[PDB]
Amino acid sequence: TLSHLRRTNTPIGRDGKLAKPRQLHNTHWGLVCPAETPEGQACGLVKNL
Amino acid sequence: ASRHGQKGTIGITYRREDMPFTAEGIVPDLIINPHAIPSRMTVAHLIECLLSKVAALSGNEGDASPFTDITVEGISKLLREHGYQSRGFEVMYNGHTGKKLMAQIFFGPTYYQRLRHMVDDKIHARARGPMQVLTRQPVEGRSRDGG
Amino acid sequence: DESAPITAEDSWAVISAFFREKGLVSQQLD
Amino acid sequence: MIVPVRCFSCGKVVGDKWESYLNLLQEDELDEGTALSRLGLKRYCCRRMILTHVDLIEKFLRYNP
Amino acid sequence: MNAPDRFELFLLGEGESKLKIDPDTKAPNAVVITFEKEDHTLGNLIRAELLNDRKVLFAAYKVEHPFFARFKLRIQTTEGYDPKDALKNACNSIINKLGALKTNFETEWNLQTLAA
Amino acid sequence: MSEEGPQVKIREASKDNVDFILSNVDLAMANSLRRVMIAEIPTLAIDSVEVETNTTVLADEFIAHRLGLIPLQSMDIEQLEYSRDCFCEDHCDKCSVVLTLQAFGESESTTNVYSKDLVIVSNLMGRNIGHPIIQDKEGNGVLICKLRKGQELKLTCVAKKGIAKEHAKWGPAAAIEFEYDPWNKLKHTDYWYEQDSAKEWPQSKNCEYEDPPNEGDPFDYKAQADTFYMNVESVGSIPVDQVVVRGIDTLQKKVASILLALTQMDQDKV
Amino acid sequence: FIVEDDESLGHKELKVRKGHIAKLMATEYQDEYTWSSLLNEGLVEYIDAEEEESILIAMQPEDLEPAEADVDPAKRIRVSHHATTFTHCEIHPSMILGVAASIIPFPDHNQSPRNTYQSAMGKQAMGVFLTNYNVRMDTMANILYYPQKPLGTTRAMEYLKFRELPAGQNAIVAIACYSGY
Amino acid sequence: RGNLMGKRVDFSARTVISGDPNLELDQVGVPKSIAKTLTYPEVVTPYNIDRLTQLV
Amino acid sequence: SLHKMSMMAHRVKVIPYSTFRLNLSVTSPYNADFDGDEMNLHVPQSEETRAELSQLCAVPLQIVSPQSNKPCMGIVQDTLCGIRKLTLRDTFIELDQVLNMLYWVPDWDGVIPTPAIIKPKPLWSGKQILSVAIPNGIHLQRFDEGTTLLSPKDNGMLIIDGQIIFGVVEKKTVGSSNGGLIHVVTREKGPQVCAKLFGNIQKVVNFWLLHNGFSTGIGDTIADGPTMREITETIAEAKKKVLDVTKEAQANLLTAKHGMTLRESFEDNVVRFLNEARDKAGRLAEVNLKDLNNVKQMVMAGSKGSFINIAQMSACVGQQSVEGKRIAFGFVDRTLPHFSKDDYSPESKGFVENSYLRGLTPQEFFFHAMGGREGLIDTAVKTAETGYIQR
Amino acid sequence: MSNTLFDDIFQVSEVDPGRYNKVCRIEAASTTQDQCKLTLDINVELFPVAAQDSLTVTIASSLNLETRSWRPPQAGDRSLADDYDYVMYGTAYKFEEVSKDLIAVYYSFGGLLMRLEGNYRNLNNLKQENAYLLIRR
RNA sequence: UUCCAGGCAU
Ligand SMILES: [Mg+2]
Ligand SMILES: [Zn+2]
Ligand SMILES: [Zn+2]
């Protein structure tokens, strides 16, 4: 119930934006969880705070 | 499933008579195959098992918390103060004959979750039935008797 | 000495203070 | 969610021992591990049982009809 | 759902004699008994005792599959001597052992004491 | 000095444990019993709840489940036939024990429902059977459930025979202990170690009762196995002894039925 | 934690002391010293990503600070206390994690991806989502008969309200080959 | 692509698979549920006639 | 279904409980696991339709894939892990059991084999009975390393007339290997014969392993007290093999190896050094773990795990990377706000020194992630482009 | 039909337990032809072995003076060509010719191997599988 | 049915 409340959706181009986006950034440290992301499909496009 | 992406469906259910037991009397509620460890490399599974087998003997909410000052070397000493193998293993007897297991098992408690997705909500069979209108082909979804 | 360093174990309590005030839903709320 | 009548592993009676455990603490001011050694719960199978059960029912009872 | 009925593990349902002995054809003077609604509890032990009769050439058993409460028992013997008998004897052997064993466990018990 | 073979020598003893040293038998035999005790020992417990009213938080079957676990008396059991055999359409005093239960939350302070509150309504036929085995300190035993203000709960149960195979709730068992050759002199194990096998692996209390190794000596390949340190516990329903005697018995029965079928089988032929 | 070298008696150090702590825990007891003040008391700040770019943080407070005196043969191997430029410090590393992660025992002992799987199934398990389901007419929902709280835990759970609303049981696992099922 | 090069069909079944070390390589354990759901048109022939009638 | 053998014909064996319970060796051809995986099954309808199934689609036939002129099934997991243990010269079995084993094999001529040891107590060796499942005329010649007709370490594999003459059995012999026992059996006999071989080898070894028991557990991931330290310096030594070659370039003192920036030419040497060192760190704990070790035992039969695994659990993990380029400075000349700018050392470019037994550091951790994430990323891409490239 | 096919006593050059908890491969020389070397593993759990020992090695495919199943006990009385200690049984795989005429045959016992050498096992050492082995003292 | 959305297969 919680996890879902603190979540993050982020639109893409129109097709698999394979590169920058999906990746895990340095600036991500401490703000977004590093291991909790939805597998396949929108992997890394949707994040958990 | 466990807490380490350790999925797995039941295969068969046994009772204590066929179940493997340790002199202590105790017997497993769950018996996972050793092969889902090396390739997946989820030691934290093995660890929680040893840590929980401890706090289960002494009753001290075993800490697993992120990064801290705990060690196998550490736990394996407390679990040695309780008399059991320092690494968790234990000798066990083959439920059928009672004849010991030439080998030892990593027999200790672990927290396990039961995700929905139970068999009986999925077995689905159709031998002809409801056919769509535009197509006249079998319909979609087990819900509606589809194919 | 109400003024000494702060060992690790201590910090946990600070975090406690956090959620005491903020709350897991902090974001959505405010 | 109430005391799990009898253990899962060995099934040894354990649905009574509850109240006696909760007391060997708030009053007899003991520590878990021992409290349980006191109620006869030896091997961990039956131990983890009490030491883990969360008596939710109380929070349930606290509702209405 | 497709859960067999619990009690089917010990209730021979409609025509199912406990035993059923088919003559092993692969070897000589040897047979195979099909035990309905029984298992290791019983099996392994008729195996043990049966394997003491010097006149027993072969003895082994097996649960066909964990889903079904059953097991076949294969017994071979010194010609002239019918394996049936070996099974017969080997059995009583266990009764007689147990019997005495009960008596002896009870001997000890009456001669005991404790307050709990 | 006497007795053909399989002799015992009870070590310790109590109303809830028969720590004994059974010796000189086939391990097969040992295990055989071990099992029989857990599995096929006739007992008794509820097997049919009849919810009349219930306001609790535990919904029906929750309660209905636990009720089957509430250990019930079964000393005499062997004189209370299984429903299935008896000719009474459904059940009767010659096959089952009937109990009742009724709670209302008067004490505006959490009222409890204990196994002690069960009410035997059917003729106990004058035989130790159907009594809510209690070992509680106070004597309340087995907390069934709780309730608040006007929370009610009317039930009606029906105990029947049954054994651990049919369900665990008929397990007179509890958990036995088992061990043999404490010094692994037959080598039925191959202790895993990091260093000294002897160190890492704890020794057992059951070593005192048997001679240590003594290097020099080669390997006794003729070594078999007698002497098994069991520890038959119990849950109450049956006196720690019977859960052993009857164990020694039920097994023995079956073993004969095999002969029995070997007789009926012969007679058969034209 | 603001770690300004505001220490005439020493060097740099967390702008908070064991005092602040026992002063806060004071309220942890009687359920007066707020987190709100731990900010105003210029004790700790909210650093957004951008601003972060220009600061230096020491992981574990203590450790990465003092001087010296053979480490522990059983522990792990951690980088040293390089520079004293340290502007701030971490509450606890465990905080990079999110709900999911937080319930995973020893997440720092598994393969990177394995901890992501558990980040998906924890959301596919059963439990006790709210102790009011008795008055909940939500289409579909499951509850475990006897919810057992975990043996192995995280301090992170204490806040995720877990031990009170667990999602499983502590079953006695036996890792071994048997029937072959 | 979705209606002619691939269709939904009759006499099909789907459930969760759990390995078994007691079936011959070529066998496939089937739930009694499906065994009563999935059929197969068989012709009445003096060969089976007897059996077939019993089944019916 | 991307295989020809993604669909096969099976014998209906109606059983209880709601699951499709299929044989094991037919596990890897469907690409089937049991963590919640479902399967579809269709029912023929015509006397000829079924004909088509049984005469071309049955698993016994599909046994040897033409896509690689080599069998596509074979003994796996439990049986594989066990088939080895049962083999070993060091393994013997007495009469009581040998008899039960013999029985469990359906065909068994019902004639016990002569014990290799009649000496004091008559015994039998794994190979001995295991060969009761191996038919006749089946011949095999191996030669691994120190193989020598009298192979010491049980190197090779010699099986004559269908009897295990010497050597250990495992993935190389009973696997879906090329010259593999299985490959031969099929050819040499029938699609049939072999099909039943899985059954015999399976039942036997499975039963024997039922009693010989088996497992894994943290204790298998710990390497020798000093052998671990021996490693902690096999690490540190490389740190300085780097620290050096760093200043050596921090002074404008290095040959820009043709077609490589001073930058590129640099990093390249860094990397090599670490992994290079990490690997041995592995082996170090590898031939260091006795035969009794479980995780090894399985890596030996070939049923799960490889050199690498052992390494990342017992010894050292490794240097995480993204696009080959170890963690970059998306944080203005540094990795995290926990580092001092312009930091090229391995403790910053993402090198996990610890082991999964020891546990990552807040940084070792986060880096491992960014790295892990990449697998997950293309996993959900390389999988799509494939599914298309396929079609 | 029944005769011995080789008899000679050797002396243990040395025994080896290569990673084998309960078995050891050994070798010795001959107290006859000094070209007669010998190799043979051995369950040293049923018959320990120390460096240098005279052990009478014998071989022949037969019972005792006077194929198929393997009777269990019974033979308590029966003929016992077992007048030894160690009595294994296996097959012989290859028949080598280590130059000159110093041949060497290999005998495997369902799991343990063996090798001989010399030349006078001519009209004696059959190629047969059958070949009970024997050791004593 | 329809149209969007979300979820699962380590
Ligand atoms: Mg799967
Ligand atoms: Zn228990
Ligand atoms: Zn009746």
Indicate the SS3 state at residue B81.
helix
Nucleotide nearest to I380 (CA to C1'): K9
Helix axes C8-21, G18-29, angle to 10 degrees: 50
Q: Does domain E1-116 have CATH number 3.30.1360.10?
A: yes
Which structure tokens are listed for F108? 């505006």
- The answer to whether C23 touches C15, Cβ cutoff 8 Å, is no
Inter-CA distances, G165 with D1, D59, F88, G101, Å: 10, 11, 48, 17
Interatomic CA distance for residues D24 and D36, integer angstroms:
9
- HSE (CB half, 13 Å, CA atoms) of F199? 5
In H1-56, alpha helices (H): 32-37, 49-55
Q: Rounded to 5 degrees, what are φ and ψ at I183?
A: -50, -45
The enclosing H or E element of G102 equals helix G99-102
Closest CA to F265 of I243, I386, E20, D15: E20
Which protein residues have Cβ within 7 A of any strand K atom? A 9, 38-42, 46; B 5-7, 39-40, 117, 132, 134, 139, 144; G 114, 117, 120-121, 123-124; I 33, 35-38
| Residues in a beta bridge with I41 | H13
CATH no. for residue J78? 2.40.50.140
Q: How many whole angstroms separate alpha carbon J17 and alpha carbon I346?
A: 45
User: Are B140 and B81 within 8 A, CB to CB?
Assistant: no
Please, do chains D and A touch (3+ CB pairs < 8 Å)? no
For chain I, the chains sharing at least 3 beta-carbon pairs closer than 8 angstroms are A, B, E, F, G, H, J
Contact E46, E93 (CB under 8 A): no
Structural Rg of chain I based on CA atoms = 27
Q: Given the DSSP bridges, would you call strands H12-16 and I38-42 parallel, antiparallel or unpaired?
A: antiparallel
Nearest to I123 by CA among E59, J87, J107: J87
Report the phi/psi class of residue F134: left, alpha or beta, with left for phi > 0 and alpha for psi in -120 to 50: beta
Distance CA J57, CA J137 (A): 10
The two three-digit tokens of residue F29, written as one number: 């035999």
**Phi, psi for residue G10 in degrees, rounded to 5:** 140, -115
- What residues contact I132, with CB distance under 8 A and at least 6 apart? I101, I102, I105, I108, I113, I200, I204
Instruction: Indicate the helix (H) or strand (E) that contains B16.
Output: none
Closest by Cα among B31, B83, I149, B17 to F171: B17
CA pair distance A48, A40, nearest whole angstrom: 16
Q: Say if residue D16 is exposed, middle or buried (CB neighbours under 10 Å; 0-12, 13-18, 19+).
A: buried
**Where on strand K do bases come within 7 A of a protein Cβ?**
1-2, 6-10
Structure tokens belonging to residue G74:
């059983």
How many Å lie between the centroid of ligand 1 and the Cα of residue G170? 24
Q: Are the C-beta atoms of residues H17 and I51 closer than 8 Å to each other?
A: no
Residue B8 CA and nucleotide K10 C1' are separated, in Å, by 9
Chains contacting G (3 or more CB pairs within 8 Å): A, B, C, D, F, H, I
Name residues whose C-beta falls within 8 Å of residue A49's C-beta, 6 or more positions apart in sequence: A6, A7, A8, A31, A32, A33, C27, G98
- The whole domain housing J15 covers 1-137
Q: Please, are residues J31 and J7 in contact by the beta-carbon 8 Å criterion?
A: no
Task: Provide the residue type at A40 as one letter.
Answer: G
Q: Are G134 and G146 in contact (CB under 8 A)?
A: no
Q: I103 in contact with G at a CB cutoff of 8 Å?
A: no
CA I125, I128, I133, I138: dihedral to nearest 10 degrees? 140
Cα G24 to Cα C18: distance, rounded to the nearest angstrom: 11
Calculate Rg over the CA atoms of chain H: 16
Structural contact between residues I211 and G180, judged by C-beta atoms closer than 8 angstroms: no
Residue I107, marked binder: no
Domains, chain F, ranges and CATH?
1-42+169-270 (3.30.1360.10), 43-168 (2.170.120.12)
Rounded Cα distance between E61 and E40, Å, is 9
Q: Do I17 and E4 touch (CB under 8 A)?
A: yes
Whole-number Å distance between alpha carbons of A3 and A27: 21
Region of D46 please: left (phi>0), alpha (psi -120 to 50) or beta. alpha
Extract long-range pairs of I374-380: CB within 8 Å, 24+ residues apart: I374/A23, I374/I322, I374/I323, I375/G113, I376/A37, I376/A39, I376/A43, I376/A44, I376/G113, I376/G116, I377/A18, I377/A22, I377/A23, I377/A43, I377/A44, I378/A18, I379/A39, I379/A40, I379/A43, I380/A39, I380/A40, I380/A41, I380/A43
CB–CB of G170 and D59 under 8 A?
no
**In a 10 Å sphere around its CB, with 0-12 CB exposed, 13-18 middle and 19+ buried, how is residue F150 labelled?**
exposed
d(CA G84, CA G82): 7
Task: Work out whether strand B124-126 and strand H12-16 pair parallel, antiparallel, or are unpaired.
Answer: antiparallel
Cβ–Cβ under 8 Å, residues F69 and D5: yes
Residue from B34, B2, B25 nearest B103 by CA: B34
CA atoms of F63 and F57, how far apart (whole Å): 10
Tokens describing residue H7: 């269709």
Cα I377 to Cα G113: distance, rounded to the nearest angstrom: 11
State which CATH number among 3.40.50.1100, 3.40.50.2020, 1.10.10.60, 3.40.50.620 fits the domain covering D1-65. 1.10.10.60
Q: Are D4 and D55 in contact (CB under 8 A)?
A: no
Round to whole Å and give the CA distance between B66 and B63. Answer: 9
Among E1, E2, E65, the residue with its CB nearest the CB of H22 is E65
Residues ≥6 apart with Cβ < 8 Å to I186? I63, I64, I71, I193, I194
Q: How far apart are CA C19 and CA C24, in angstroms?
A: 6
- Hey, what are G130's tokens? 């709210």
Could you tell me the residue range of the domain that residue G7 belongs to? 1-98
Domain ranges of chain D: 1-65
- Distance between the alpha carbon (CA) of I257 and the C1' atom of K3, Å: 61
Domain count, chain J: 1
Query: Strand runs (DSSP E) across chain G, as ranges?
Result: 57-58, 88-89, 169-175
Contact between residue I88 and residue I151 where contact means Cβ atoms under 8 Å apart: no
Cα first-last separation, chain E: 45
Region of H27 please: left (phi>0), alpha (psi -120 to 50) or beta: beta
- CA I231 to C1' K10, in angstroms, rounded, equals 32
Q: How far is the alpha carbon of J47 from chain E, nearest alpha carbon, in Å? A: 26
Q: How far is CA J112 from the centre of its chain?
A: 11
Contact F95, F81 (CB under 8 A): yes
- For the record, the structure tokens of F250 come out as 């039920």
| Token pair belonging to B64 | 């697993």
Do residues I199 and H25 touch, judged by C-beta distance below 8 A?
yes
Residue G99 structure tokens: 């709900």
* Widest pairwise Cα distance in chain J: 47
Nearest to I96 among E3, E30, E51 (CB): E51
How far apart (Å, rounded) are the C-alpha atoms in residues A17 and A12? 6
How far is H46 from H42, CA to CA, in rounded Å?
Answer: 12
Q: Say how far apart CA I174 and CA I76 lie, in whole Å.
A: 9
b/e per residue I351-360 (b: at least 16 CB within 10 A): bbbbbbbbbb
Task: Say if CB I205 and CB I79 are below 8 A apart.
Answer: yes
User: What is the spatial distance between Cα A35 and Cα A3, in angstroms, rounded to a whole number?
Assistant: 13
Beta J6-16 vs J54-60: how paired, if at all?
Answer: antiparallel
- The residues, any chain, with a CB within 8 Å of residue I82's CB and separated by 6 or more, are G177, I205, I206, I208, I209, I212, I214, I301
- Contact across the interface for J111 and I111, Cβ inside 8 Å: no
Q: Output the CA F95–ligand 3 centroid distance in Å.
A: 4
Token pair for residue H5?
A: 């090069």
Residue reference for tokens 């050793």? B34
CA-closest candidate to residue F230, choices B23, B17, B20? B23
Q: What share of chain E is helix, strand, coil (3-state, %, to 5)?
A: 35, 20, 45
| CA-angle at I179, arms to I175 and I182, nearest 5° | 45
Nearest CA in chain F to J49: F218
* Count of CB pairs separated by less than 8 Å, B with H: 58
Neighbours of J82 (CB within 10 A): 16
Nearest chain I residue to B36 by CA distance is I304
The CA distance from F160 to F166, in Å, is 12
- The DSSP letter of residue I114 is P
Q: Which two tokens stand for residue F176?
A: 């036995």
Do H and C make contact, counting contact as 3+ CB pairs within 8 angstroms? no
Residue I95's identity, in one-letter code, is L
How far the first Cα of chain B sits from its last, in Å, is 30
Cα B31-B33-B37 angle, rounded to 5 deg: 125
Q: How far apart are CA J87 and CA A25, in angstroms?
A: 71
Q: Check residue I26 and report its DSSP letter.
A: T
Give the number of other Cβ atoms within 10 Å of residue I325's Cβ.
11
Instruction: Give me the resolution in angstroms, 1 decimal.
Output: 3.9
Question: Do residues G109 and B43 lie in contact, with contact meaning Cβ atoms separated by under 8 Å?
Answer: yes
Give, as one character, the DSSP assignment of residue G47: -
Question: Do the Cβ atoms of B59 and D48 come closer than 8 Å?
Answer: no
User: The tokens of G87 are what?
Assistant: 């502007």
How many angstroms separate the CA atoms of F168 and F69, rounded? 8
Helix (H) or strand (E) holding F100: strand F97-104
CA distance B106 to I217: 5
Interface test with J, best of I89, I169, I291 (most J CBs within 10 A): I89
- Label each residue of chain F as H, E or C: CCCCCCECCECCCECCEEEEEEECCCHHHHHHHHHHHHCCCCCCEEEEECCCEECCCCCHHHHHHHHHHCCCCCCCHHHCCCCCCCCCCCCCCCCCEEEEEEEECCCCCCEEEEHHHCEECCCCCCCCCCCCCCCCCCCCCCEEEEECCCCEEEEEEEEECCCCCCCHHHCCCCCCCCCCCCCCCCCCCCCCCCCCHHHHCCCCHHHCCCCCCCCCCCCCCCCCCCCEEEEECCCCCCCCCHHHHHHHHHHHHHHHHHHHHHHHHHHCCC
Q: Tell me the CATH number for domain I71-212.
A: 1.10.274.100
d(CA F30, CA F49): 38
Structure token digits, residue F219: 């390997």
Alpha-carbon gap: B102 to the closest alpha carbon of chain F (Å) = 4
Q: Token pair of F249, please? A: 């018995």
Residue for token digits 């890492």?
F200
Residue E86, classed as helix, strand or coil, is helix
Neighbouring C-alpha atoms within 13 Å toward the C-beta of B130: 11
Closest-lying nucleotide for B36 based on CA to C1': K10
Q: What are phi and psi of I296, to 5 degrees?
A: -80, -50
As a whole number of angstroms, the distance between CA J28 and CA J38 comes to 5
G151 closest CA partner among G105, G114, G115 = G105
CA of F14 from ligand 2 middle (Å) equals: 19
* I43 Cβ contact partners less than 8 Å away, ≥ 6 residues apart: B127, H11, H12, H13, H38, H39, H40
- The closest CB to that of I45, out of H21, H28, H41, belongs to H41
In the numeric block, the tokens 């159709």 are attached to B126
